[PDB]
Amino acid sequence: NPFQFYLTRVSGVKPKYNSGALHIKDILSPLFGTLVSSAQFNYCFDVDWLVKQYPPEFRKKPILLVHGDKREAKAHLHAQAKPYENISLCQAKLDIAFGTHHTKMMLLLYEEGLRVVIHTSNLIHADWHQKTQGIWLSPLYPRIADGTHKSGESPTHFKADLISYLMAYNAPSLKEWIDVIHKHDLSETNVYLIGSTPGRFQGSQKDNWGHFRLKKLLKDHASSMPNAESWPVVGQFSSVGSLGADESKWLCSEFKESMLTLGKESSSVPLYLIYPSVENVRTSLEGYPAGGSLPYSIQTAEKQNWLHSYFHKWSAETSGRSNAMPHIKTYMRPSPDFSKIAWFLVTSANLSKAAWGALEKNGTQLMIRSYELGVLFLPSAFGLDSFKVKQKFFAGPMATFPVPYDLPPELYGSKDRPWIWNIPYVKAPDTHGNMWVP
Ligand SMILES: O=C(O)c1cnc2c(S(=O)(=O)O)cccc2c1O
């Protein structure tokens, strides 16, 4: 494979379904590089657990934790990290209300070079235990020789785009990492960076972030095909924000319109949304506690029942993960028979205006509340017109993309309901014999 897209290891599936998978100990292993220093961007941290995932010989190397916690949450994180003298913290500024820092990324500085990891898991045991999570592993980026003047840029502009993403924090600890990235050659990168940073973007900055960034990339670097209107859009996520009183308010107006974009020319395109049903959660490896990480509240859900008619069950026979609840988020553009895809995105961004941006000020301003990060796989970046969909995720031309769940997605049945995490489920017990009583 040239794609370097991986799933996390799942405890309890047969070895065939973990052979190509990565645990965090694998990512941090000396086999990937001799660690000098690392930055861990995330949302939730268990610092004691996290340090144990580094190899013992690397556990005292400097670690920067990049988080968005404030007030007592911030105090708790500092208290977690105080026992470890090698850990520094960077509080990402969140100057827009209800914003959060969801970006999940490792910067791994080695003796031998630099690696970037963009993924979907929190740095806590349960996010790596029995969930479906996604990982993109960059190549080993070599250092540019001192005195040599080259860009180290890729055809996808990844180096400049990653620096741009880090510059938005205005953070001194991240300027140090910007200087590290400047000194490395990222030219082999074949993915496009799609980030969200908090702010209100107009004019020349509108296209930098969120769903407008996606739109711009798809306009510039994808081709429209005949009967493009028949190629569905698939969104797959683990949380849902408040999208409005009907589909025209945001989902099908600006969000779907960005995702439909192909090529530079000026809708009945089917939209499949994949989100675990109650039954998916009940019968999962974790049982009802998997719903602890699917934080769709009844208060939000009751305001937008129109949305649930778009919902499809989680199903992942292709990767043996139908019972490993998703915390990965993915978006893609399959062909009408789901045999090909025009692009694939793995990201931290859930289906929310906070994550993707919402137009304001008469359509002239894109307001984003949160930090998010993902990578976009475009066929043009691999010298292809489309990706073939890999039939078995862990099977054996290497130019077929490993989609981690089943296509076509399966609509909710009439008795199915979306997992809603703050109501009780006491009709049927889960795989551990328990009910769900919040
Ligand atoms: O991956 C993330 O960044 C993320 C963020 N938030 C979560 C919440 S909640 O803080 O929104 O209540 C509840 C359960 C899981 C969450 C999660 O996985």
Whether residue 110 sits in one domain with residue 245: no
Q: Are 272 and 408 in contact (CB under 8 A)?
A: yes
Three-state SS at 181: helix
Long-range contacts, 50-58 (Cβ 8 Å, 24+)? 50/123, 51/84, 51/87, 53/24, 53/25, 53/28, 54/28, 55/25, 55/28, 55/29, 55/30, 57/30, 58/28, 58/30
Alpha carbons 389 and 3: distance in angstroms, whole number: 13
346 phi and psi angles, rounded to 5 deg = -115, 135
Whether residue 144 sits in one domain with residue 220: no
Q: Are 310 and 271 in contact (CB under 8 A)?
A: yes
Three-state SS at 180: helix
Q: Which of 190, 222, 247 is the last residue of a domain?
A: 190
Q: What is the CATH number of the domain that holds 252?
A: 3.30.870.10
Pairing verdict, β 329-334 and 365-368:
unpaired
Whether residue 150 sits in one domain with residue 54: yes
Q: Which atom of ligand 1 is nearest to the CA of 238?
A: 18
* Strand ranges inside 177-249, DSSP E: 192-196, 199-202, 233-236
Distance 291 CA to ligand 1 centre (A): 11
Percentages (nearest 5) of helix, strand, coil residues in the chain: 25, 25, 50
Choose one of 44, 131, 238 to mutate for the ligand 1 pocket test, by most ligand atoms within 8 angstroms of C-beta.
Answer: 44
Whether residue 136 sits in one domain with residue 10: yes
Q: Are 132 and 108 in contact (CB under 8 A)?
A: no
Q: How far is CA 220 from the centre of its chain?
A: 22
Q: Taking the CA atoms of the chain, what radius of gyration do you get in angstroms?
A: 21
Alpha carbons 101 and 103: distance in angstroms, whole number: 6
Whether residue 181 sits in one domain with residue 245: no
How many C-beta atoms surround the C-beta of residue 24 within 10 A? 24
Q: How many angstroms is the resolution?
A: 1.9
219 assigned ligand-binding residue: no
Three-state SS at 256: helix
Residue 118 falls in which region: left (phi positive, over 0), alpha (psi -120 to 50) or beta: beta
Residue nearest to atom 14 of ligand 1 (CA): 293
Q: Which atom of ligand 1 is nearest to the CA of 292?
A: 14
Residues ≥6 apart with Cβ < 8 Å to 239: 294, 295, 296, 350, 351, 352
Pairing verdict, β 199-202 and 358-360:
unpaired
Whether residue 195 sits in one domain with residue 176: no
Sheet of 358-360: strand order equals 199-202, 365-368, 358-360
- Set 67, 101, 102, 221: catalytic member: 102
Nearest in space to 384 (alpha carbons), one of 183, 222, 254? 222
Distance 275 CA to ligand 1 centre (A): 15
Residues ≥6 apart with Cβ < 8 Å to 286: 126, 129, 130, 131, 325, 431
Q: Are 285 and 291 in contact (CB under 8 A)?
A: no
Residue nearest to atom 15 of ligand 1 (CA): 293
Experimental approach was X-ray
70 assigned ligand-binding residue: no
Residue nearest to atom 10 of ligand 1 (CA): 295
Whether residue 153 sits in one domain with residue 214: no
Residues ≥6 apart with Cβ < 8 Å to 435: 288, 424, 425, 426, 429
Q: Which residues line ligand 1 (CB under 6 A)?
A: 43, 102, 122, 293, 295
Distance 94 CA to ligand 1 centre (A): 16
- Structural domains in the chain (count): 2
Alpha carbons 367 and 194: distance in angstroms, whole number: 16
183 phi and psi angles, rounded to 5 deg = -85, 5
Choose one of 40, 43, 94, 351 to mutate for the ligand 1 pocket test, by most ligand atoms within 8 angstroms of C-beta.
Answer: 43
Q: Which amino acid is at 70?
A: K
Long-range contacts, 157-164 (Cβ 8 Å, 24+)? 157/192, 158/186, 158/189, 158/191, 158/192, 158/193, 159/186, 159/187, 159/189, 161/192, 161/193, 161/195, 162/116, 162/186, 162/193, 164/208
Whether residue 393 sits in one domain with residue 375: yes
Q: Which amino acid is at 337?
A: D
Whether residue 393 sits in one domain with residue 267: yes
**Dihedral, CA atoms, 9, 74, 241, 333, nearest 10 degrees?**
-40
Alpha carbons 5 and 108: distance in angstroms, whole number: 17
Q: Which of 175, 190, 205 is the last residue of a domain?
A: 190
Dmax over CA atoms of the chain, in Å, equals: 69
In this structure, what token pair is assigned to residue 163?
Answer: 């620096």
In this structure, what token pair is assigned to residue 252?
Answer: 């099908």
β-strand partners of 329:
347
In this structure, what token pair is assigned to residue 206?
Answer: 């509108």
Whether residue 125 sits in one domain with residue 243: no
Distance 96 CA to ligand 1 centre (A): 18
Distance 328 CA to ligand 1 centre (A): 12
221 is catalytic: no
Whether residue 148 sits in one domain with residue 27: yes
Distance 279 CA to ligand 1 centre (A): 21
Nearest in space to 422 (alpha carbons), one of 285, 292, 241? 292
22 phi and psi angles, rounded to 5 deg = -125, 125
User: Concatenated DSSP letters for 280-334?
Assistant: HHHTSSS-GGGGGG----HHHHTT-GGGGGGEE----GGGT-TTS-B--EEEEEE
DSSP symbol at 252: I
177: containing domain: 1-190
Distance 223 CA to ligand 1 centre (A): 35
- Set 67, 119, 184, 327: catalytic member: 327
Alpha carbons 225 and 267: distance in angstroms, whole number: 15
Vertex 239 angle, CA 236 and 243, to 5° = 95
Whether residue 425 sits in one domain with residue 323: yes
78 is catalytic: no
Nearest in space to 278 (alpha carbons), one of 311, 316, 305? 311
Burial grade of 427 (CB within 10 A; 0-12, 13-18, 19 or more): exposed
**Dihedral, CA atoms, 154, 157, 160, 164, nearest 10 degrees?**
-150
Q: Which atom of ligand 1 is nearest to the CA of 121?
A: 1
Residues ≥6 apart with Cβ < 8 Å to 113: 33, 140, 141, 142, 143, 184
Question: Residue written as tokens 């009780």?
Answer: 424
Omega of the bond prior to 408 within 30 degrees of 0, cis? Answer: yes
Q: Which of 160, 190, 220 is the last residue of a domain?
A: 190
β-strand partners of 114:
109, 141
Q: Are 138 and 184 in contact (CB under 8 A)?
A: no
Nearest in space to 85 (alpha carbons), one of 109, 59, 108, 121? 59
Q: Which amino acid is at 16?
A: K
Pairing verdict, β 192-196 and 372-377:
antiparallel
The HSE-up count of residue 391 (CA atoms within 13 Å, CB side) is 2
Q: Which amino acid is at 166?
A: L
Q: Are 337 and 331 in contact (CB under 8 A)?
A: no
Roughly what angle, to the nearest 10 degrees, separates helices 158-167 and 172-182? 170
Alpha carbons 274 and 326: distance in angstroms, whole number: 10
In this structure, what token pair is assigned to residue 402?
Answer: 């490993």
The HSE-up count of residue 146 (CA atoms within 13 Å, CB side) is 1
CA distances from 285 to 163, 229, 295, 392, 411 (A): 39, 38, 18, 21, 22
Residue nearest to atom 17 of ligand 1 (CA): 293
